[PDB]
Each structure stands twice: as C-alpha cells, then as structure tokens.
Design a protein around this ligand. Structure first.
Ligand SMILES: [Mg+2]
Ligand SMILES: [Zn+2]
Ligand SMILES: [Zn+2]
Lengths: 76, 86, 166, 199, 122, 55, 512, 97, 39
C-alpha cells in the first residue's frame, strides 16, 4: 500500500506478454472478442476492460512483498 | 623413436616382486585374537553410540519385551564444561 | 495403509484455468502418483487431502500456473508385523507367488521357515498338508535407472494353526 | 572475437534481415514497410487457438507461394515438422488441432524491431508495426529519421523479428514508437518534423 | 518430490474405502477423455482396491462405530497395531483372537476374549 | 524415409538459406539444419594428413 | 594430511560410530572451534554434538581450552586418534612385562579412557571371575599391587584433575573447569583400604573420587623404542650386547626424559652391578663389549667421559636415524630389488655423487642403473641439488647429483603407510559388508544352536543346521575369515613401521 | 554464420545489448540472445555440479540428481574450456520458486 | 548481475524481471481437511 498506486510500463509489458502467451495456449477469453485473431490485441482489450486475472506481486528489496490487482491499479 | 601402442596400460600392472609373507608365531595370533575381541566388545559398550533410529512405524505391545535397554554411563560433569548437559 | 505428507510442485496449463484450482490440483496429483512407488516410502495409492496451498506463480517461460502444494496421501507400507490376506496367484518350487487381492503381486514368501513339510513340485502345490494369511518381515527398496519391482519384501508363515484351511 | 565479447556479450541471431531504406511519408510513425521477399522468409510461430483457427487455416491453404501464408506446420502431440510446399495443404488445414505451431509469414500488425548498426542511444533501435509492400526497401515515416540518424544515402538497416509473444509485447510497450517520442537524456523530443516538412 | 513423514498417521480400511468411493464418484461425475488417456492406471488401481475392500467385511461401517470400538478397546491396554488389525479383519470367531492375534500370551486371560467378541460384533 | 507412411522419396531442396530433407508425398521433414565450418576458423585450423597422423 | 584424516575417520567409524566420527573429522580438519560453529557446520542436532564431544573427551581424544570472553574451544588430537590403533601392542607388552591382571587393567583403561582405581579393580575382578573356576574368589590386594607396580613404572598416569573450586575463587564458576595437571601426584596412588570379591556375573561413598588414570602412551613408545634398538644390536653383534644395552636402558628409563639427544652418564661399574646374575661375564669382558660398541660404525654408544672407570653414553637420535635408514633400505630392496638397494645405499653413504660415479662404485652396467635412479627419483626418495653454472639454470650447462633426504623420505613413507592401512581397513569393511547376507545366515543358523543350549536341549535340532544352503558356502566364510585375519595382521605389522617412522620424525623436532 | 554469402544473420553487438538493457526488456533480450541464437539443452547433476548427457552423470555414475537445463551454447562451450583448464565451474542448481 | 543473467540465459533482475506475477485462479487457501477416524 506504500508503493505507487499507478501501474508502470514494465508491469504493463509483462502482464500483456503473459496474457498473450496464455491466450495463445487456448486460454478462456473474458472480453468476448469480436474477430480479433491476434492474441496481443486480445490482451490489450482485456487490459482496457480491466479484467485480467493476474495479480502483480511486488517484492521490496528487504524481502517484504505486496499484491496488487489489475483493477486495483491505475492504468494509463 | 618410441613405437605406438594400440592398447592403454592395464589397470593393474604386474610386478615381479611380491609382498613378504607375514610374520607368524604366538605373537601375531594373539594380536589377531585381541583385535577381534576388541572389535566385538567395543560395539556393545555405551561409548559406541549408534545412530538413533527414526520414522518409527507404530508402538506395539511387545515393545517393552524388545526394548533395547542398556546401562548408561554418567560423564563426570565436574571435568566436563557446562555446555554439554542435555 | 498410512498417510504421508508430500510437498509437490504442480504445473497446470493455462487452458485449464476455467476449472477450479482445488480440483485440477487433485486431478493432476492423482494422475502423477497413480500405481507408483515412492522410494523408501512404499506404493502410493491416491491423494487423501490437501492441507496447504500457497500462491499460484506464473513463470516467464512456459507461462503455466505453478503451485507448491502440501498434501497428505495414502501409501501401502506394513510395520514389519502386520497380517494381510492374499490370494495364491501362482507358486514356484522355491517360493509361492501369492498376490494381494487386486493390489500388487509382490509378496514372495520363502519356503524355509514353517515346519519341515514344505515342498513345491511345480504342480501348483501350496504346502504339503500336516484367503491366505501373510506376515510381512522386512521391506526393501532399490533403483531402476542405471544406464543412459523395488518393493517385494519377505513374508513370515509361523505356526498359525490354520483351522479353516489346513 | 573471443568467447566473452564475440560469443557472450554479443552474438549473431537468426530471423533477422538487412535491407536498404527509403523514405515514405504515407506511413505512420509507428509503422514500417517490409518487402514481400523478406516477409516470405521471416516467419513467426503462432499457436493454434479457438480464435485464430480460420485465419491459420486460410494461411495454410494459401501455402508458401502466396504472401499471406505459412511455411511449416508443427503438431501438438508429435514434434514433427511438415513443409507446406509438398502434400495436399487442404488436408493439413482441415487437420489443424489446438496448440499446433504454425510458422506464418510476416503480415500486417506484427510488432517488429528496427535497428541501425551504429547504436548510440536507446532510440537507435525501436519497435514498429510491420506492413508489407511489393517494393524491396524498408519504408517508414521520416519523422523517425532523427533517432536513427539516417539520411537515405545507401545506408543499410537491420530488422529483427521476435519469436515469443512476451518479447513482442515488451517490444510494443517499452520500445513503442509512440511511447519513446522523447529522449531520456534531457527530455527533448526527437521524433518531430524534419526537412521538406518544416519548410 | 521430498517426503516429510512416511508414517505420520495410521488409518484403517474404512477411511480408504470412503476415499475410494469419493474418488470414484468424483471421476464418474467429472469424466475427461484426455485426462483418462494420459494415465489410465488411476481408474484401474481405484477400481481394483475398491473391489478388494468390498470383498473384505469392511462394509457396513461408520465413523461413529469406529470411534466407539476405539474407546472400548482403549480400556484393555491394547496397542494401536492390534486394534487396527482387529478393525481391518473384524474377527467374528474367538480362534482368530486367541491364535491369529499376535502376542496372545498373558493377554487372553480367558475372560477378555468374550468382551472383544461382543465389541467387534457391535 | 518417411516415419509415418514409410515413403523413401526424400529429396534435398535448397530452402531460403536452409538445407533440409523432406518427403515429396506428405511434405514432412526428417532432418533439418546443417552444420558447416566458417572461414574464420578455417584459416586458423591446420590441416593434418594420414601420412603424418600415423607415425 | 588427507591420508591421516581418512585413517582417523575409518578408525572412529569402526570404534565409536557415525554421529561422533563426523564431529571428530570436523575437529581434525578445521582445528579448534566452539561448539556452536561445530553444530552449524556439521548440520546435526545439538544433543548429538554434545554426546560426541563428551564421548571423545572421555577417551582423552580431544581437549578444550578457554579464551577471551570465556568462550570454550574444542581441539582434537590427530596423533592421539592415530595412537589408538596401537592398543593391542600395548596390551601385549603389559601382558609380557606383567601378569594378565595388568593386561586387563590396561585394557579397561584404554577402553574407558578415564576411570578410578576402585572402578578399574572392580572391572578387572568381574572380568577375571569367569576366567577362573573351582568356586574360589579373588581379592583386590593383588590387583592394587599390580596397579601400583604399573604406576611406579610410569605405564599409567593420573589424568589432569580440576583443582579445588572452593579454594580457587569461590563464586561464579567459569564455563570450563580448566583442568590442570601436577607432576607431584602424576604417579602417586592414594590409599584405598577397601577390599572385596568380584562377582561371577550371575545377574541375579567413593574414596578415590576425582582421581582418574590413563595409559601413558609415552612410556609404551619409549619401551618399544628400547625393544627395537635391543633387537637391532642383537642382530648386529650378539645377544650379550643386547642384554647389556637392555640393562643400561632399564637403568636410564627413570633418570632420563622421553626426548633427549643423549642419556645420563652411566659408568661400567654400576652397569655391571645392576646386570642380572644369569650371565657369568667378568668386568673385563664388559669393558671390551663397551669399547667395541664405541668403535661400531653405527655409533650407537659413545664414551663422553673417562671418570668412574668406564664412562659411556648412548645415542638415541643416532640409533633412531640408523633404524630409519635400515627401514628405508629394506623397503627400497623389497620394492625395487637388491641392485636398486645397493645403489640407494651407495648414494646414501656418499653425500653427492654423479651417474658415472654411481655406475663405477655400484658396479652395474649402463641402461639399468640410470633406470633405477629414475625410478627412485620418481618416488620422492632422492633429490637433485642442481648446482648451476649460470643463474639461468639451463639444464645443458649445469650439474646434477643425487642426494637422499632421510626426513622427506621418512615423511612420505609414513604417509604411504597411513594410506596403506586406510586401504586395508576399507578392504576389510568391503569384504564384511559384501558378505553380510551370508554373515546373517550363519548367525541365525548358529543362534538356533546357541538358544536352548541347556534348557530344553533336544537332539533333533542338530542334524538340520548343516542341512541348510549355507553348507556349500562355508568355504566362502572360511576365506572371508582368513582374509580378515591376514588384513588385521598386516595392519598391526605396518603399525610398528609407523611407530618407528613417527619416532624418527619426532626425535629431531625441537618445538622452538 | 558471419558473411552474407555464407547465409549469415545479423549480429546483436554490444551497443544493441546496451540499448535492450536500458529499455528493460528482459524477455526480449532473453529471446534474442539465448532462445533464437544459441539455445541448447544440457544435463546438470545437483550433487557434483558437473555436466551430464542424456540424463546421466558419468562422474557420480548415477542419474537421480541429473536434471535438464536450458543454456546458451556459448556458455556451455565456455564451461567446457574452463574445465579443460582445470578450472571447474560447479553449478549448484535450485528450484525456480 | 545482468551480465551473468545474459550469459547464463536467465531473465535479468532489472526491467520487468524485478517483480513476480500471480494468477487470479478460483481457489480456496487451506481447503477443508478430511477428518481422521482411527486417529
Ligand atoms: Mg548516410
Ligand atoms: Zn509422410
Ligand atoms: Zn554427479
């Protein structure tokens, strides 16, 4: 709860990559795509809809961690 | 010029000399007897601490019948530092 | 029959994310430890229950869901004195080939401890008369791979009388 | 050319091309034109899912001769590779199971890298959206000439194609042309108007 | 792959029977083609062990009866192994307690066998 | 030969800077990729003859 | 000292177990370390570390010292761990110089490390009860007499006892009792007027508390060195000279220490008076013997004075050097032959010598003497001085002369003997574990007979033991037994060479 | 290979690696410099820390602790060359968690 | 270090590899345990 409430660009890139890799592996679609054959476009649509089932586990250097949901974080 | 060898040397090269036969007599016989007796009698002594058996399966009625009971020697704590008391 | 605490890493592919995790984990654990023998433990039967299930990580590689699951599973391992009831699925001159009912054919009792009336003349003769009881004696384990089974154990047959069958 | 500098710090890769560049104002700043000849060579491995099944079927039916298509098909169960140049492509297209790896040709919308050999700052290599054109040169918007420090006087340009969805997403997000309009040195914008546009 | 405890808690055949029935009903309610084709040994071992337990007198049992039997046998100073074997075998005859039961010496007393029979028959 | 159908009609054809073996019937490859020496290492290595590597 | 560590590990695993041998090897390899870091590095439970340390300090194998902040540091003695292999020789020499009572006394002292006089006499009585028969019983008087006779002869010594804590700063006790030793009561025995009779093990308040004894390995080493030099001079000149030197060494045992270049001055008159009366030798014959021993090219004895008639002294260091030379030439002769032994003795007599000079003085044709020289140099028995003509040290313009360094040769020979005994112990354990199934079969078929030996002994159980499948395998059992016996005999025989080499190494050490 | 006539590909020099590091694209750099250039699969034994083949450790003469591992081929060549120089890199494996 | 991450072929700690991701799967931490009857 002490880190930045906004969602950085590296987190966005990693989440989109993981979601595209999952969708390419026949993952269930949560946004009901309409003729989108590119998995990265599907990941972009899911990020825009704020329904990505991925929780960012931020690790502090001392050892402490914290979980942040996609809907909880602020996207740009 | 040394010739080429098609086979590596054996793992146990032979030597024309052999070990001298062992000394015999009542002395060496008593040596063997005493060494065997010590090897036998030293294992059951309390000094020979075996590894504590673990992952005990269950407790049975005949445990007290098969319980390994042996006298335990008490080390002199006056000569031993205090950091070894269980 | 005894419980064993097993901590295993389970990889669930992303195309099974629609399924419940607590069910897919159990299914994968049952598929991974079916009709197998854990070394120095015994033949595991199936998953009994799941005690602890921590967070589900996703690695930057395969991308599947990896979970470290703590669970308890049932295995078959007598305590060197348990009495079992097996059926005679064969017999050899050096020892009878008795197999536990539909469980495993690994029990080979040596014919060298009962009263001196033991002889198998290859005609499926169990024991020269004066649902078979079995007394396990010692377990034994070994490896399989040695180049680029493992649980048989001995059986005791004391003077149990056997009023129902000789 | 030792192990440390020539084989560990920097090493050669495949799925890359090197071509002469030429200006094209009719393309967006985040888009780049790729010749059909290089597009038919550089392939991307896509996995068959419930969404792009028909598109991959059509690509397989086209074959390695027509530009929109594939060159090899990898099955899910077995790790065998099938060349689409021989055999009835309709059979393999109708026998496309989920999870199969198909090496499709470079088509529009694919995120592709674009780099010059002398790399001074990070903006010398950027990720763009690939587009195909019948010509034989790498065409892009001239507003990106300032980061690349190109002058269209015969200088060769490199182009790398990632083979992983994670790498493609990282290239589109971090190395996106629209997301790197300013240099991290002093914040001054580099992708802007140039000669024949200012006048 | 690591093992924590091979003999953490001993269980009788009734718990194994219940677990087998639960796994069988879960598999028949959630049957999958590829999951079955991946490892067919699961269904085989489950069915065979269930049939073996059904051949035994392990039927007609409940956890309350097992708890009552345990509380009744705890008063006869018997160990866990003997009561476990008695529960797994369910001896309806006295000869199986006087002869088949190990360590019968000094434990029969010619009077507790009737109580053991009355408890195992209930 | 073909691993599935057994056809032995495997042909060597030059791909886009790639050498591989493929059957003309099912279009399945059996062996792809070839390892060739680089001229950078060729000028470094010294040739040895069997007139000298035998004594 | 990898071979030494391996031998100590094998001996500890054979004698005390596994959880303690690991702590012992850790102490030997890492030196003195506190208990906490020992438990941390070993990775075992703390109670097992405490038990290992206590069972090690019981046999006087390890020691503990105090340092800054009152921390206790435990250090192992690799030499003490190596010396425990020589226990059968100690028991044999104490059974030869004394009766079997002293034999059992030293046996119990070695098997227990630290014990009291009452405890050891009780154990000796209990062990000797089953030895004798006819209903009679023994007392503690003769056992105490044998104990005090061992004490005055310095074979047994009182363990270092903690001083009186009441007089030494009565209050907060330190973590370690700080055991000290006093030379006054080192061999003194307090009076124990209590007596008793040992029980026959039917299986149906301490006046000497705080006083613990242990076998003095220094006395045994000195006695073995004396026996070795006596056997040497007997094989050299005669048995009469051996008896003379045995008498002089017996006289010098008390007046000299364990480490000295020479003994105390002894005159011929007192040696003649202390000589046993079994020899009808006159004073003139003794003087002739002494003056011919003084002219020996070995220089075992020396005049070193003329007062008091015939004054003479013995050379301990020179005698040990001669014994080491004899051992080295013997092992060279047995490993490479008589001609190579001749070459070795030639290159040992002359300080420096050249190849052509070697061939001339040894009378050996070419292509063989140089081969023997190379074979002896490849085994670290000789060294080349390599006197250079130029500081470049080019081989073409420098000389090469062979020279035998007895110190390094003895050290490498001791290392070879250590590794040899380790390999013998490993082979014995391998042969034991590979036949453990036949061993258990024999044990069970012999315990069927061991049971019901007297009570319920029916004859029907005597014709079926040999009927088992172990009967054709009895030859393998006999071979295993004779192999174990031969391995143990070889180890005990190499132990004497190890003792000789260790004595020769230690005698030239000054510890300065 | 290096030359164009030898069907050689492009080279990701030091400056390209520097730019990819500055962008923070870990997965892109991993795919470029490892997966698409010199990817290989070796076998490492967790006991001795050496390299094995076909899931077998010739050193320990066992195959229980042997596990497969992805690696750039240049790194394996470097390890082999260092082992030839009596400089043994002992690889201590661990779980990905 | 990033150098050995590139050499050994593992994702570098800097960049996107600093944090970790968790999949939001439908589950129940510490599921109900089957009770023991004999013990
Ligand atoms: Mg230019
Ligand atoms: Zn085919
Ligand atoms: Zn290994």
């Amino acid at each position: 709860r002490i880190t930045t409430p906004y969602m950085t660009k590296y987190e966005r890139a990693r989440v989109l990559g993981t979601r595209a890799l999952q969708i390419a592996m026949c993952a269930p679609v949560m946004v009901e795509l309409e003729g989108e054959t590119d998995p990265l476009l599907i990941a972009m649509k899911e990020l825009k809809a704020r329904k990505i089932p991925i929780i960012i586990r931020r690790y502090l250097p001392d050892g402490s961690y914290e979980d942040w949901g996609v809907d909880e974080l602020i996207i740009t | 010029l040394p010739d080429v060898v098609l086979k590596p040397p054996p793992l146990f090269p032979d030597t024309d000399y052999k070990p001298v036969p062992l000394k015999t007599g009542e002395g060496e016989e008593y040596m063997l007897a005493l060494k065997q007796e010590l090897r036998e009698t030293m294992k059951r002594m309390p000094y020979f601490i075996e590894t504590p058996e673990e992952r005990q399966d269950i407790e049975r009625y005949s445990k007290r019948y098969m319980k390994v009971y042996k006298e335990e020697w008490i080390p002199d704590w006056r000569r031993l530092p205090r950091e070894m008391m269980p | 029959f005894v419980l064993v605490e097993m901590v295993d890493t389970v990889r669930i592919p992303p195309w099974q994310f629609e399924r419940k995790l607590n069910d897919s984990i159990a299914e994968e654990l049952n598929k991974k430890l079916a009709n197998k023998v854990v070394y120095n433990v015994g033949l595991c039967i199936c998953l009994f229950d799941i005690t602890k299930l921590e967070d589900a990580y996703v690695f930057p590689g395969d991308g599947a869901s990896h979970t470290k699951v703590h669970f308890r599973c049932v295995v078959f391992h007598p305590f060197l004195d348990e009495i079992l009831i097996g059926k005679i699925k064969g017999c050899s001159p050096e020892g009878v080939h008795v197999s536990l009912g539909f469980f495993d054919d690994i029990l080979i009792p040596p014919e060298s401890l009962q009263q001196p009336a033991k002889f198998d003349e290859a005609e499926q003769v169990w024991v020269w008369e004066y649902g078979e009881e079995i007394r396990f004696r010692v377990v034994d384990e070994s490896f399989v791979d040695t180049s680029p089974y493992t649980l048989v154990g001995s059986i005791s047959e004391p003077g149990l009388g056997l009023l129902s069958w000789w | 050319q030792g192990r440390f500098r020539g084989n560990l710090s920097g090493k050669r890769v495949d799925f890359s091309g090197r071509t002469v560049i030429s200006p094209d104002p009719n393309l967006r700043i985040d888009e780049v034109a790729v010749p059909v000849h290089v597009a038919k060579i550089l392939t991307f491995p896509e996995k068959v899912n419930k969404a792009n099944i028909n598109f991959l079927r059509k690509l397989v039916q086209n074959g390695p001769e027509v530009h929109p298509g594939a060159n090899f098909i990898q099955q899910r169960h077995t790790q065998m590779k099938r060349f689409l140049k021989y055999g009835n492509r309709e059979k393999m297209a109708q026998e496309l199971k989920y999870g199969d790896i198909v090496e499709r040709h470079l088509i529009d919308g694919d995120v592709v890298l674009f780099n010059r050999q002398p790399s001074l700052h990070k903006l010398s290599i950027m990720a763009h959206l690939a587009r195909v054109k019948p010509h034989r040169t790498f065409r892009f918007n001239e507003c990106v000439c300032t980061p690349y420090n190109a002058d269209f006087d015969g200088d060769e340009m490199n182009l790398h194609l990632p083979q992983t969805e994670e790498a493609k997403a990282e290239a589109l997000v971090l190395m996106g042309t629209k997301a790197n309009l300013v240099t991290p040195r002093n914040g001054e914008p580099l992708i802007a108007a140039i000669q024949d546009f200012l006048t | 792959m690591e093992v924590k405890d091979a003999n953490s808690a001993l269980l009788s055949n009734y718990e194994v029977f219940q677990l087998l029935t639960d796994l069988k009903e879960q598999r028949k309610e959630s049957g999958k083609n590829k999951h079955s084709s991946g490892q067919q040994n699961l269904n085989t071992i489950t069915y065979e062990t269930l049939k073996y337990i059904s051949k035994t007198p392990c039927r007609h049992q409940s956890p309350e009866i097992v708890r009552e039997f345990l509380t009744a046998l705890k008063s006869h100073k018997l160990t866990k192994a003997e009561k476990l074997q008695l529960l797994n075998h369910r001896p309806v005859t006295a000869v199986e307690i006087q002869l088949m039961v190990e360590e019968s010496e000094e434990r029969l007393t010619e009077e507790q066998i009737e109580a053991l029979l009355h408890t195992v028959t209930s | 030969r073909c691993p599935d159908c057994g056809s032995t009609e495997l042909v060597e054809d030059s791909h886009y800077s790639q050498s591989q073996l493929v059957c003309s019937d099912c279009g399945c490859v059996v062996t792809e990729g070839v390892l060739t020496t680089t001229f950078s290492d060729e000028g470094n290595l010294r040739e040895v003859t069997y007139s000298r590597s035998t004594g | 000292t990898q071979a030494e560590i391996k031998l100590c590990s094998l001996l500890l695993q054979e004698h005390f177990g596994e959880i303690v041998e690991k702590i012992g090897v850790h102490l030997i390899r890492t030196g003195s370390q506190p208990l906490r870091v020992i438990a941390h590095d070993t990775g075992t439970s703390l109670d097992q570390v405490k038990k290992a340390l206590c069972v090690l300090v019981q046999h006087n194998l390890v020691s503990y010292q105090v340092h800054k902040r009152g921390v206790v540091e435990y250090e192992a003695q690799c030499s003490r761990v190596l010396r425990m292999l020589r226990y059968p020789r100690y028991i044999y020499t104490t059974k030869t110089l004394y009766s079997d009572t002293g034999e059992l006394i030293v046996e119990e002292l070695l098997l227990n490390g630290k014990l009291t006089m009452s405890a050891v006499v009780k154990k000796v009585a209990d062990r000797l009860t089953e030895t004798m028969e006819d209903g009679k019983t023994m007392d503690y008087a003769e056992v105490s007499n044998t104990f005090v006779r061992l004490a005055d002869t310095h074979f047994v010594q009182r363990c270092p006892s903690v001083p009186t804590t009441e007089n030494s700063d009565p209050g907060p006790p330190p973590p370690a009792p700080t055991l000290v030793i006093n030379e006054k009561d080192m061999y003194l025995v307090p009076k124990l007027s209590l007596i008793g009779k040992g029980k026959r093990r039917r299986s149906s308040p301490i006046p000497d508390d705080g006083i613990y004894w242990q076998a003095n390995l220094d006395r045994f080493h000195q006695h073995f060195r004396d026996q070795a030099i006596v056997s040497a001079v007997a094989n050299r000149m005669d048995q009469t000279s051996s008896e003379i030197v045995r008498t002089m060494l017996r006289m010098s045992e008390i007046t000299t220490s364990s480490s000295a270049p020479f003994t105390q001055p002894l005159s011929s008159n007192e040696i003649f008076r202390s000589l046993p009366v079994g020899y009808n030798i006159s004073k003139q014959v003794l003087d002739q013997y002494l003056t011919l021993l003084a002219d020996d090219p070995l220089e075992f004895v020396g005049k070193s004075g003329d007062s008091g008639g015939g004054m003479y002294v013995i050379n301990l260091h020179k005698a040990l050097a001669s014994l080491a030379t004899a051992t080295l030439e013997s092992v060279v002769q047995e490993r490479f032959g008589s001609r190579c032994a001749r070459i070795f003795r030639l290159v040992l007599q002359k300080k420096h010598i050249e190849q052509k000079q070697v061939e001339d003085f040894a009378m050996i044709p070419a292509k063989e003497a140089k081969d023997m020289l190379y074979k002896m140099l490849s085994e670290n028995f000789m060294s080349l001085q390599e006197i250079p003509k130029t500081p470049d040290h080019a081989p073409s313009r420098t000389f090469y002369l062979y020279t035998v360094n007895i110190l390094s040769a003895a050290r490498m020979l001791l290392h070879r003997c250590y590794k040899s005994i380790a390999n013998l112990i490993e082979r014995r354990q391998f042969e034991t574990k590979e036949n453990k199934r036949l061993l258990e079969k024999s044990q069970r078929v012999e315990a069927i007979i061991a049971s019901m030996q007297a009570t319920g002994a029916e004859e029907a159980q005597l014709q079926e033991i040999e009927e088992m499948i172990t009967a054709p395998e009895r030859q393998q059992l006999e071979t295993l037994k004779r192999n174990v016996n031969k391995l143990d005999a070889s180890e005990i025989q190499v132990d004497e060479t190890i003792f000789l080499l260790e004595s020769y190494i230690e005698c030239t050490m000054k510890r300065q | 290979t290096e030359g164009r006539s030898r069907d050689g590909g492009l080279r990701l020099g030091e400056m390209e690696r520097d730019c990819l590091i500055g962008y923070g694209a870990s997965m892109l750099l991993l795919e470029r410099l490892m997966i698409s250039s010199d990817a290989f699969e070796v076998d490492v034994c967790g006991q001795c820390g050496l390299l094995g083949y076909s899931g077998w450790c010739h050193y320990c003469k066992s195959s229980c602790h042997v596990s497969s591992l992805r690696i750039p081929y240049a790194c394996k060549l470097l390890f082999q060359e260092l082992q030839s120089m009596n400089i043994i890199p002992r690889l201590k494996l661990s779980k990905y968690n | 270090g990033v150098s050995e991450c590139i050499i050994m072929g593992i994702p570098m700690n800097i960049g996107t590899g600093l944090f970790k991701l968790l999949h939001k799967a439908d589950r129940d931490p510490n599921p109900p345990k089957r009770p023991l009857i004999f013990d």
